[PDB]
Structure formats: structure tokens, C-alpha cells
Amino acid sequence: GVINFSHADTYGNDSVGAHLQNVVYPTDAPFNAATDGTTDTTVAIKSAIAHCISKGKKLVLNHLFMITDTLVISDGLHVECLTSDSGVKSDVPAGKFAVKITGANSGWFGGKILGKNLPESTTVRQDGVLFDENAEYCFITGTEVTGFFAKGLHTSDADGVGYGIYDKGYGTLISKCYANSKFCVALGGTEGRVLKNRITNNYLTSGEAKPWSWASNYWDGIVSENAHRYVIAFNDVSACGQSGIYFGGNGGYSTDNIIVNNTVYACWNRGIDMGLFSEKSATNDVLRNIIKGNNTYNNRENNIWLAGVSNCSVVGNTSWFDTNYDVIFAGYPGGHICISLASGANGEACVGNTIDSNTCIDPRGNAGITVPTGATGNVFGSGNNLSQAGAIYIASPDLITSNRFELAVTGSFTPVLLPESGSITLSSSSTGVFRATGNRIDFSVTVNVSSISSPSGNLNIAYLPGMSGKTSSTSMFIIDYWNDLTLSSGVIPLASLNLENQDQITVYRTDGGRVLYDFSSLMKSTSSFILKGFVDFN
Amino acid sequence: GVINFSHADTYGNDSVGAHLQNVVYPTDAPFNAATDGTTDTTVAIKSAIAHCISKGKKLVLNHLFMITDTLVISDGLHVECLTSDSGVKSDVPAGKFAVKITGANSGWFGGKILGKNLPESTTVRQDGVLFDENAEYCFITGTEVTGFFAKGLHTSDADGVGYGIYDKGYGTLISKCYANSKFCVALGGTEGRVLKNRITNNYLTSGEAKPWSWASNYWDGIVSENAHRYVIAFNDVSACGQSGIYFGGNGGYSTDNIIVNNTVYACWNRGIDMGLFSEKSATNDVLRNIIKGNNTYNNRENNIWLAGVSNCSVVGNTSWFDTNYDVIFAGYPGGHICISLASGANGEACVGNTIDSNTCIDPRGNAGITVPTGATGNVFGSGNNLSQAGAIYIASPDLITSNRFELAVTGSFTPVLLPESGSITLSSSSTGVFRATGNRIDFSVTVNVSSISSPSGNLNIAYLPGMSGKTSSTSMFIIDYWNDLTLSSGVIPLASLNLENQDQITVYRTDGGRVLYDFSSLMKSTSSFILKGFVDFN
Amino acid sequence: GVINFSHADTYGNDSVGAHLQNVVYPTDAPFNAATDGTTDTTVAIKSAIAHCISKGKKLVLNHLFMITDTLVISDGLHVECLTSDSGVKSDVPAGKFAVKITGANSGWFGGKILGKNLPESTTVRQDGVLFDENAEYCFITGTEVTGFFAKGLHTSDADGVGYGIYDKGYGTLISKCYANSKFCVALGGTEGRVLKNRITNNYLTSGEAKPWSWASNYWDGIVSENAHRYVIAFNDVSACGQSGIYFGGNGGYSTDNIIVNNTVYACWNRGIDMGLFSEKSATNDVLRNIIKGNNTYNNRENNIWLAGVSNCSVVGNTSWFDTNYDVIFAGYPGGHICISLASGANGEACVGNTIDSNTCIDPRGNAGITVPTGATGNVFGSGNNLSQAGAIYIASPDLITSNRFELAVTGSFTPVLLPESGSITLSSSSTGVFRATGNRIDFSVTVNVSSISSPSGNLNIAYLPGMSGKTSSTSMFIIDYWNDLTLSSGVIPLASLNLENQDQITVYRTDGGRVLYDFSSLMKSTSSFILKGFVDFN
């Protein structure tokens, strides 16, 4: 039966009570919060919060407290949870958050912020932690934020969304947390740091009926729109109902984020997902994001996905699949591509992205990197290692001169002959092969004539893939085999790139101290020759 | 002479005592731990631990407490050390740890966990901190864990091993610690985060007699077996008796770890060491680890070492040596290679690894990267910078088509001529040079005949290094010099890759509007010619 | 009116008072610090510090305390700030710091360390936090360190410098801080970790009159001299009066630092700035630093700047500009280069640096990477993406064989003909084009004669850029066009690299079963020919 104590009393500077008044528990007088975990404590905690702000004192939650209205942590207040079991259990209604953090340097340490966790309910809708637009350098660290769900999509925030943690602040730190909710973490602010968190909503073990649809209670690990200058590092992101780490693109202008050294696996959509769903605009785009040094694997609809984004980089990641893909995604096969580039939803091109030094492992032999028609300005570095996957795939040969494939791409085309007069028709056995390495294309062209119709004058081979309307700095071609040409002794064929139409190669021949451009006149219906060389294009 | 206080008494909610009961010091009643640092306090601390778990209270160690049995931190309990001098001094016997952390979110902040620190003793054996197999998201942060040693190898854990911190948990955080013990940190769990630690056992200043042997009390900074999905970042790892950061491979299946932005230097074995000692199996392998952005230097038996591992990457590291190597390792020289690939101990190949964008500095001119016979599927990127080291070394020329050397490799071979009939013998001055860049090999072949024996018919040059049984997409060859051939005026030599045996080049000649394959008939005993060109192989 | 309490009294082990004595507030007796924020509290805080060190207790600052002399945090003491508004307001005079941290494991958590913040004053000079040369594994975490300024440069530290935080210790952690001062953070120690800080002195909104000059009160975000083995990661560095992150080079030997995953923008000098201002010496150099995965943009005098440094790497950064550059730097245009290499201030060469996998965006089309004359041993990887900037710029063609440009460089030269006897003069329409890719140079040379003067004998083309005195492993050249040569039927021109002078190409011709080196004799005043090929140089 020890002395009475209250944060409302005035004590002398030398007293036990003054010393104790530096730390406030909501169970202390005059707040007197319940300790049974079931009685509402919102009034007691709100009073303790306001007192600590007014008097400049530390607030420590020493139990798991039931609440029914938002706790607003403002004015630089820090909430410290006494133990990992302390914190709040939220019965806050739809349209409000359990905890709202705002102001300069406000934050929350430790403990638990727990929603109802009824993801099968078609009526419960809740939101966990909000850092609002006036949060500056706020934080939540070491906290289990779980159980915020909302079946069916909202039309507005007032419906309740199912966010675990939603950051709209500047410089927010989210670190050492466990976030598990319909949208585990949502990013809509600037300069945040999302570090060493465990992020999942465990869609794979949820029991929610498949296929996935917009009615699901299980979406992304990290969903980002209007996110700028975040660093997302050292997180363990897995088994989410949509993508592990997503940036849009869907009413969002998301730029300059750095996604590094995370593990992202077993998600039902993509692993790391950057793309445009809404049409590109000054207020909707995904630009200049860095994806580096991550391990991404067994994500159903591709491990690293770029759709219509620009100036992004994918460097030094290990992206892979194994046969557990066929188990966890049984019945619902997806793209199964290690690194895929695509158009935006409304056809926008991937522009200016940089893919280098990644290791892609795909035992199905699916292409480790895919490139779609329309992509421009991208660089596919030769430090990428696809030896344990399929080779890089391009959807059309014109990509080889509108992008730079240091990782080499090989293909074929059907050549034709363009006589100055008349015509020459080639047998179908005629064949052209190209390989692009950087801004060099190597060629082998086999020309087997099947018929002629009064050909005469100059002769060109056409059409070199990718070269239409391009120019070149240098090129080099030989003809190393021929048969049934009308050539005098000592006359040999020569070949040189057509500098007017640089997807054509001019074929001509020697005449002592000069050359002659009459090769079409030397062709017969049974002529054959083979051309080899390269073009350094601009 | 102030009021009595005890965590065993019941106080009113409004009392001083209830407020104080939220924080437990083991010196408080009823625990009454000694404060002299020499009296055993195990019973008092065990009681305080059990009380804090039962009552949901915070445990603070306010002295350095002597203990003789394991403290078990379970059930989400956090141990907070009051000051950097608080914590435990361990007299726990061999076969047990000083501290065992288990359960969900249990952990330890600050202070000291101190072993006997008698590394010269042939009888003292101790272990420091264990995160056991039931640890989930546990942690130790800000702690000096030192002095756990055990001279001579254990046969089982019950002997006592000499671990400083041993993590077998899921999601364990080890951060801001100083770990110094026979094995400073040992990793055998999943999804741990080993961040911004100081790791060393100071072998160089130990005075333990050299050479190193299995009886040493000084092994690795980080030793890992069955380690999955760790991030090891921002650590300062140095002067260890074996390797700085090691993954096996020796009864361990270690995969998907990310080792980034560490400094690793002056270790007696390797800096960052990934390899197989036990034979490769479904339960013993080292796969898909990422080594990125580290600074590794003056490690005696090589800075970055890969032995029989697969799908690993080494990207963007700076690996170097200076003349202090000759000082600290005087008398005991080692490999002194910046980045070395080797076979596993039982001959297993390095498969599918990716080495790019590293800067290697070796003033001895030792090769900055070494590649052994048998390696396959590896990619050596051209962004590596070995200008301040020796050039990349390959142990046999066949490696150039079973791996992809964007970082170019040059070599030589001795050509032969393969006449269709008869024989042609070349002088020893005949020479072939190749350079592989990616999937292109450039060649120069000088053919000087010394004798002939009735050669006639077709002619091939052989054997192109790496090309045996390979195919090609395109190739291009000329003969730009010859002497003492039997060629009529206007007949010139031609050369084209043999498409049946693509390590041979067919040599033939012109005959007006066709070509003729009778070159062996045009050779004399004094013939010479020189061939130049390239092959784009598949 | 509760019981008296004092840290000077002796209490029983079972007492309230003994429990309370583990935590010291400076307002407690016998220290009795003022709480008004204006009365000097230095004596009270110094006494509390000494008491906590002597008795092994925790020190908590529970108000913002005014101080007029340095607080020395030594002996492993930690200062904990009760709230984000607690800490110290410094009226310490010029030549001393507000707080000095030294010893093993000493540090400061939270709160504020506030200077006078009068950057317009020509007389106020102050310094914030010092980690001195005897600091080992000390830290400051979670602290706002602002307002330390000093207009005009010091001549010595005793003048007062304007440091926010100055680290000369070993292993110092600076994390989660806001640092804003004349020099926000200064690094002069070893193995520090500067993590997830906000760093700025807001030069752009200061109102200090422009142009910037050495009299400014606004210098770098991070200024480093004699800095070794730091990791600088996850910081938000912007709007500084000089550079964001600087290493010298100016009385400093700075090596082995790792600068990763930071955002650096809007600085008035450079973003990430490594360079030599003082002449290179054994005690002044910048070596082996790693710059990886940063986003650097709109820094006035270039985003990433290397001046006379060696063995550094720039890998995987996104470096860019937009039209806001023209707004914030209106009136004061700067270099506006994404990645620039330069000589040191005294002409020292950039040696051995590695630039790969960066994405450069410059809508002005300025070169994304610039290389100066004299640079050697550098590697410019082909994974760099400059498609959205100007192409890499080299200041002289000789750079192509003293560095390795995997990112290809194209240029031109004016050829000459070197007859064995006599002379040949070319028309000005004669032209040579080269492209260097790695250690391969491709060439196209057009030779149009305008006059001859008795030429006879052998013939060489000269001079190939970069090749003077170089050797080669292989090379391949053809002549694919000619006109007005004196060639009999069946005689064709041949070309081969001059192996004595490998910046010359020998031009000669066929003569049946041999070749003849008399090409100068076959030239006329109207001759033309075109040469194509490549050299693989060593």
C-alpha cells in the first residue's frame, strides 16, 4: 500500500513524484486506463497523449489497449510500447485509421497495432497506421501492424481501404516492422525509408477462393502511387495476393525511388512491379527508379516487371524460378519470366531503361529477359547472365537499332536482289542471318537464284533488319563463295554498304584498275553467292 | 531511508509502486541480485525473467551480472541493458550458451555478453548467444559479445564450440554489435539481417603460434551453413583466423544470401569465401548468393573466393592488395588473387556465376580474376576493370566457348593443315592467335609450310580453340598474304568456315565465275599464307 | 507533496529510491537543473554526467537545456533525450563544441543539439558535435543538430569552424539525424557509418547574396578529408551551398569509402564530389571509393565529379537533369554534366576508375560522361545508358588506347600516304573514321589523291588514332573500292597492318602465287581507294 501518485498533481523538484512524472503510463492517474484488453481505453489514451504533448513528457503504453477512435500522435510525440505485447487493438470504424502520425519527428516504437483480422468478412473495413501529409521525419519502428482488411474495393478513403501502413509524409521511416493487411504498406509520400521489414498478407495460406479477382482481400505487399525518393531496402516480401513491391502509374507520378537488397518471392502477381495502368500524363508516370541487388523468385506473373516505364534501371539482381512454382501456383499458371519489359496498359513504350549484370535462372528455358515492340532507348548489358535461362527475346527485329543489345540478339531474314533493270528471283533456300552486338550487326547472306527476267546494271541485296533509314560509321563486307556467275578470269565480286539506303548492300566487281557496277548483267538463273560482313551503325 | 518496494507486492493502480512495477531491475526485490560482479546472480535473473514474462513487464539489467547457467529469453521478452557496461559475464559450462533467445520477437539491447576470454586455454570451452530454431523475428542490437573460445574442434555442439553469436532462427536481426570469438558469428537460419557490426577475432595480434591449423582458437568472422536469404551489410570484418564471410558447402545448403557494402580485410583465409568442402548434394551446396559493392583487401588466401558454387554473382566490388600484405602475412604467403574461381573440394564445377563491374588492383600483376578448367555458364563482364592488376587468367582455351568472356581473353595455338589427300607439314614458326570477346572469336593464323607429301584436293586449317563441335551464326575470313603458291594470274585464295567441323577453316580459290576446292594441289614445300577473320559462335 | 529524493543519498536495496537511482534526470537533486530553457545549466549537467559515469547509471535529458561549455560524453556514457524536444541549446563560444563524444561506446540518442543559427552574423562562430580521435564505436542517432555557423573561413579549429557533426573517431555511427550547419557533417575518421540522415544547409532559401564565395556560411553536406572505410548510405542530401557528398584531396588521404543508395540533389557545387585540390602525395589522395546505386540530379557544377582520383568506381547510379535546373540556378549556370572526369587541380590524372551501368539523362544533350586528356586505365562499361543524354565525350583520340571504352567512341582523322620513295598528296576530301569498342578499333579510310611526285615502292596509310607504338593480337583489312589505279587484269589490292609501326596499314597487291609491295608505283594523280577493317590492339 504505497504512496498515491498522479500526473495531475504538482510536486516539488526534489520529489519522487517529479521524477516519476517524466514517464506517463495510461494506467497512471488521472488517466486510469483499463488493463483487461476489452474495456475501451480511447478516452484515457487520448488524455495521456494530450498531457504528454502539453507537458513535454514520454508516453509508454504498458498494455494492449482496446481503442475505438483514431489516436493522433502529433507535435513530435513518441509512443513507446513497454513490451512487444503492448500497443493497441483497434475497433475503429471504417473510414478512420487506428493511429495517425503527423507533425515533425512524431513516431511509434515497438509493440502491436492490431485490426480485427477478419479477411473473410464482407462487412468489416479498417485501416491501420496513417502518416498524413503533414508528417515530417516521422517513424514507426519495431511494430507488428496486422489484421486491417476490407473485402471489395473502396470508392474513396472514407469507405475504409485495408491499409496496414499508409505513408503520405516526408521522410517517414518504416523499419523493423511486420506489416500484414490487404495492402500491407502503401507509399504516397516523399523521401521515406522502408527498411528491414517483414511484409506479407499470406495469400497462399489464406483459404480465400481462387482465382484472384478485384474482390480479394489480399493485394500488394508495397503499393506505391505518387511515391518519390523512397529507399526500400532489406525487406522480406512474400506470398502477397498481388505484387510484392509495386509502383504506378495508376493515378500516381512515382519517381526516383531506390529498391535494393530485398527478397521478393511467391507473390500472386509480380515480384517487383513498375508499370502504367492509367494513361501516361504529367501526373501519371513511373520514372527513374533503381532496382538493384534484389533476389526475386517464383512470382507468378513475372519476377521483375516493367510496363511502359522510363529511365528505370534493373542492375545486379538475381531473378529465378524452380519447380516449386508449379506447386504453389498449381491451376493458375502465369508468365514465368525473370525480367520482362512490356507496353503500358494503353500502349506506352518502355523508354530509356537500363538492364545489366542480372543473373536469370529459368529451368523451363523461358527467355530470361523479354523486350516488346515499341521499346526505345533501352540498353541490355552484356553483363547479364542468361546461360541458365532462355536467351533474351525480342518481339521484332527493328528493336536492334532502336535499343542497344550488348547482350547479343540473333535472327534471320529473307533476302531479295534489286537489279537496276529487270528482275531476279531467289529460291526459298536463300537466307540471311544477323547478330546484333551493341551498335554492330554482323551478317551472313546466302543468295541462290531461281529465275531471272532480263536483269542488267547495278545490283543491291536487301533488306538488312533494323537498318532502314539508319546511317553507319563503318562497315565491311566480302563475298567468299560464288557459283555460275558470268565472270572473266581475274574478275572477283566486291560488296559495299549502299550509303544512300543503308539497309542495302551494293554488289559489284573488279575491272583491273577500276570497279564496275554491272553485276546484274553477270547473273544467271542458277547463280549463287554468299556475303559476309558487319555494319557499325549510328 | 525511503519506502520499501517489491515486484511481489500488490499495489493500487494510483500508487508509486504500480508505476514502478512496469520496469524490473534484477536488484529489486524479490530478486535481490548481487551487484559486486562476482557473486552468482543466475537465480535472481532467471526469476526476474520469468516474472517479466508472466506479468508483461520490461526487464532492465543494471549491472554486469555473473551467471553460471543459460538465460532463456523467450515469449517476446526484451532484455534492455541500462548502460554499455551492463549485461552478463558468463561462467556457463561447455555445451551450453550464455544466453538463448527463442520465441516471437524476443531480444536483447545493448550492454555486454562476456565469456572467459582465455583463447590459450586447452580446456575452457564456451558459447555466447544462441537464437534457436524456434526464434522468429528475434534480435540482438548494440551488444559486445566477446570472449567465447574453445581450443580444438568439437565433435558435437555438446562439447562447446566457441560461437560468439549462433543464429538458427527465422528473421533474426544482429545489428550494431561487436562480435569477437572463435567463430564470431555463425548463421544457420533463414531471412536474418546481419547489419553494421564489427566482426573480428584479432588473429594477427593474438600471439597464437603459426602456422594456422585446425587446432586454432581463431576461425571465421561469419561462418554459414544452411543459411538462406540473409542480408549481410555494412559490417567491418577483419583480421580473422580464417575467412571474413564464409558460406558452405560443408554440411550446409546455403542459398539466396545478399552480401553487400561490407569491408573485409586482413583475414588469414579468404575475404568473402563461398565454396563446397563436402561433396555436392541436395543438402550441400552454395547457390544464388549476391556479392555486391564490397571493399575486400589483403586477405591472405584471396579476397573473393568461389569454389564449386553456382548461380552466384560478384558485381561492383573493389578487391585489392598492397604491400602491407607482405608484412602481416610475412612467412605465410597465400594465393593473393582478387577474385578467384575454383573447383569444389571434390572437383565440382563453378556453374552459372556472374562477375561484372569489379575493380581489381594487384601491384604484383597477379591475374585479377582466375577461371579454372571445368567452369561452365559463367559470364565475365567487360565492365570489370583489371587495368591495375594482371589480366583475367583462364586455365584452358576451351573455356572461351563454355563461358562468355566479355572481358576479352587472348591466346595462341599451333595450326595444322588437313589436305584431302596426302600430307602437309608446317614449320614451327606457324602460329595461331585468338581473342574471344563475348560469343565472337577473332583469329590470325600464319601458315609456313616446311614439307609436303603428295598433297591434293581440298584443304582445311585446324583446330580453332574452343570450337570443336560448336556451331556459328556468321563468320568472315580473308587471306591477306601468301607466297610460293601455284596460282595462275587472277586466281586468289578464299577462306570460309567449315560448316561440318566448325573448328576448321576451308581454304580454296577462285576460277572465274566459280570457285575450286583444290588448294592442296597448289601448295609447295615453301608455301606461306596468312588468314584473318572472326567467328560468331552459338 | 511526495517523498524527497536525491541521487546523493544512500538507499536500501529494497527501496523506491534505489530503484529510481538507476535513471538520472539533471533536474533531480543534487543537480537541480533549471527548466526555463534560458538559465545556464552547464554545471548541473556536467555534474549529472560525472555522477552517471561514476555510478554506472543512465542519463536522460528531460528538457531543452541551455549550456555555455562543452559537455564531454565519455567512458561509454549514453545520453538519452526524453523527447524530441529535449537536448541542449548551445551558447558555447568559438573554438569549442557543444558536445564532445569520446571513449568506447559513448553516444547520444534523440532530441536536439541547437546552435545560435545566425548565419548572417559576421561574428558568431560555433561547432556542434565532435567525435574526437579517442572515440571508438561511438554514436549519435535520432538527433536534430542544427544552427552551427561561422561566416568566413577559419585559419585553425580554435577559430570555430561551423561543423554540425565532426567525426574523427573509429567506427562512429551517425544515423537518423537531421544535420544542417555550415559544414553539415565532416568526416575525418575510420570505419564510420553515416546512415539514413537528412543533410542540408538550405543554401537555395537562405537569402545569402550570390555569387557563392569562400566567405559563404553554406558549404558541403558531407565534407571528408582523411576519411577511410566509411559507408554513407540512405541519406537525403540536398540544397547545400557547396557539394552534397565530398571527399578530398585537400590535406586528406581518403580511401576505401562506400557511398551507396543516397539521393543527392540541388547542390550549388557537385552532387558526389571526389577530387584533389592540394597536390597528390602519400598523405593527400582519393582512392578506391565506391559510388553505387545513388540518384543524383540537378547539381549545379555536375552530379558525379571525379577530379584526379584513382581506383574509384561509379556503378549503377541514375544521374540526371531537368528544366528545374534553369530555375534554381538562374543567373549562375554551371557544368551540367551527369558524370564528369577531370584532372586534379594540379593536373593529376584520373587513373584506374570504373564507370559502368549508370543511367544518364540530360535533355540539353550534354555528354552524359566526359573524359579528359591524360586519363589512363579507366574502363567505361557498355552497360552505361546515355541514350537520353549526349554520347560519351573524349577530349582527345589517344584516350581510346590508354583506357577501355566498351561504351563505344567514334571519331575521325585525316589520312596520309607514305610512299617508300617520292610523295603522294591527298585531296582534303580524303577521310578516316574510327570507332573504338573495347580493345577493338574499326576503321573506314577514303583515300583520294590530288597530286603525286615520283612515288614508287611500298605504300603505307597513316596515322591510325591511338595506335602509335601499340601492338595488336589480330587485325583484318580489305580494300573494297578503287579507281584509276595502274593494275593489270586480275591484280587486286591487299591491305595488312604494318607490324613495325602499328598505326600504319601497308597497301600492296597480288601477283599470281605471290604478292608485291610496289603499290606506290601503281598510283596516279587521280587514284582513289577505300579501306575497311579492324585492329584488336593490346
TrEMBL record, chains A, B, C:
It is found in: Virion. The keyword ATP-binding does not apply. Signal peptide: none annotated. Keywords: Virion. GO terms for biological process: biological process involved in interaction with host; viral life cycle. The lineage of its organism: Viruses, Duplodnaviria, Heunggongvirae, Uroviricota, Caudoviricetes. Residues 148-318 form the Right handed beta helix domain. GO terms for cellular component: virion component. This is Tailspike. It comes from the Viruses. The chain holds residues 261 to 798 of 798 of the full protein.
